[PDB]
Structures are given as structure tokens and as C-alpha cells.
Amino acid sequence: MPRVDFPRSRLRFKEKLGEGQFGEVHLCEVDSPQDLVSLDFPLNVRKGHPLLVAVKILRPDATKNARNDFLKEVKIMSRLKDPNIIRLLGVCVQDDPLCMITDYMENGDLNQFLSAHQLEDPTISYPMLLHVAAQIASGMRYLATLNFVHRDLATRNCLVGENFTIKIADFGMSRNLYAGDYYRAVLPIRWMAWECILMGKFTTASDVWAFGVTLWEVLMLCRAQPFGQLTDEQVIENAGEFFRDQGRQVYLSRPPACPQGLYELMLRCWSRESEQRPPFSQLHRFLAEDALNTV
Ligand SMILES: Cc1ccc(NC(=O)c2ccc(CN3CCN(C)CC3)cc2)cc1Nc1nccc(-c2cccnc2)n1
């Protein structure tokens, strides 16, 4: 827990960014942020330009369980300090409504960003795609070593900062744009390892599987939904085929930009056995070294 609340009186409402069962996320401008610049709030103020933040707000009539989960997220976010994980800027928890505040990325989520680019034969290069993926692996290494499981890794849950910096986040199913990526609890089945779908087992190994699918998205420049040839019920059936291990399971195809070795990395992320999936330390090393060294 942060020692002092961010002053709610400085948050100027701009836009509603999303909603869920227990609250909303708003885009706010911080009024006169130079007044707040301190050790507690080391805000990056650009004179002449508004300071924008995302604010997650718990409904004041939230249940006890909803409130506890919100405070659990506060506690988790207060620990996360890595260049490739979204940073908590402040909280409002002394009074209702409870709030968490992070930076707002004008470049949007990584899906939005890659969707707006084309592959260099605006453009983005294959080496930059590897850098994006390496950053995600590095953030995931950090999370896993702190004994967190993400459970919803995908390009839609990564934010694009300045100079191609990628921040892993977790927004939940709070945005209409990605409703088709979730199956009705509400689950991102196309990113989920077979054991998640069949047994509800979520682990770092299943985060690795999701990382494989996220890497696939990146190399596809977010042009195709994973398993777009399959209905939701068929995706669940595909998980059964991984369980069966009789060679009928469908794997995502190799993207045109993806060399065979990188594709085989992805296939290893989709190993039937968790213990055969590469750790994030290895995924990062492969992307930052092996793949980048073989352009
Ligand atoms: C305002 C806020 C409050 C909380 C969070 N929280 C997280 O992003 C997050 C990240 C990692 C974890 C780790 N956790 C481990 C356990 N498992 C099960 C889940 C994940 C938890 C929360 C983000 C935000 N930021 C946010 N939220 C929604 C939209 C945007 C946003 C949208 C567009 C551009 N810029 C920002 N930004």
C-alpha cells in the first residue's frame, strides 16, 4: 500500500474507456501536475501538453468480495516495477470510490498499434517485431519470478509506450472491441493452453502457451484472430485433441514473416506437457539473441 492517496480533486474526467461488473476505467487529465511532482508522484510533465492517466474505479456499491479483489489488485500493482509492465502511478483508497491510476498510452494497445502498421518489405520492421516480442517475454519473466500468473496474455493487453516500449497490462473483458476474444466464466479460449480449458489449470507454463499465441499475433501484425477457421466450441474441442495427443490437434500456422526456427519456438510453447514449454528466461534469450542475430 502507497502511503498517501493521489488527490482525486486533480483528476479531470475526459472519457470512459471501459466497464465491467465492478467498475469502470476512465481517461483523466491531471490538473496542474507540476504541483504534484514529488518522490511520491514522479509525474512526467510536458509543459504545454496535458498529462493523461487511466483511472480504474471500483463502484461505490461493490460487494465485499469485489472490494477485496480490487484491493488485492492494488497490492499486486504496487509491487510491479519493471520497464515492461504497466506502472501504478497512484491510488485513491482512503475514501470511496477506490481508484488505481496508471499512465495512459496515446499509441494504444499493441493490437491497435500493429493493426495500424504494415510490414517493411507507417511500417514496422521484422527486427522491431522481435524487439516487441522480447519485451513481452521480459515482462513475463518478471511476473513469473514474482510468482504471478497472468492468465490473459494477448496483444490486446499490452500497451505501446514511447520509442516502441511495451508495457504488459491486464484489463479484463472490459472493452467491447475485443468481445469476440472471450467465450461465455468469460475466458480467452483462443489464447488458452489445453489444460486451462479442460482442467482450469493456470500456470506460468500456460502463460508461455499464451505467449506463443501472442507472438503469432505479433508476427501476423494482428491481421487475423487465432483459430479464425474454428468456432468457439471447436476451439474447446481442439483443446481436447491436445489432451488426446493423437496428431489431430490444430496448430496456428507459421506466419509469412516468421522463420522456421522461431515457428518451432512457438511450437515448443504449445508442447502438450507443461515441463516441455520454454521458460520466459529462455524465450527472452531466444528473441533477444538467436532470432535477432539471424536476420
Ligand atoms: C488504470 C489501471 C488500473 C489497473 C491496471 N492493472 C493492470 O494492468 C494489471 C497488470 C498486471 C497484473 C498482474 N496480475 C497477476 C494475477 N493475474 C491473475 C492477473 C494479472 C494485474 C493488473 C491497469 C490500468 N491501466 C489501464 N486500464 C485500462 C485501460 C488502459 C489504457 C488504455 C489505453 C491506453 N492506455 C491505457 N490502462
Residue numbers in the entry: 600 to 720, 736 to 798, 803 to 913
Question: What do the authors report?
Answer:
The discoidin domain receptors (DDRs), DDR1 and DDR2, are unique among the receptor tyrosine kinases (RTKs) in being activated by interaction with the extracellular matrix. A single transmembrane helix links to the cytoplasmic domain, where a larger JM region precedes the catalytic C-terminal kinase domain. Overall, DDR1 displays the classical bilobal architecture of a tyrosine kinase. As observed for ABL, both type II inhibitors induce an inactive conformation of DDR1 characterized by a “DFG-Asp out, αC-Glu in” configuration.
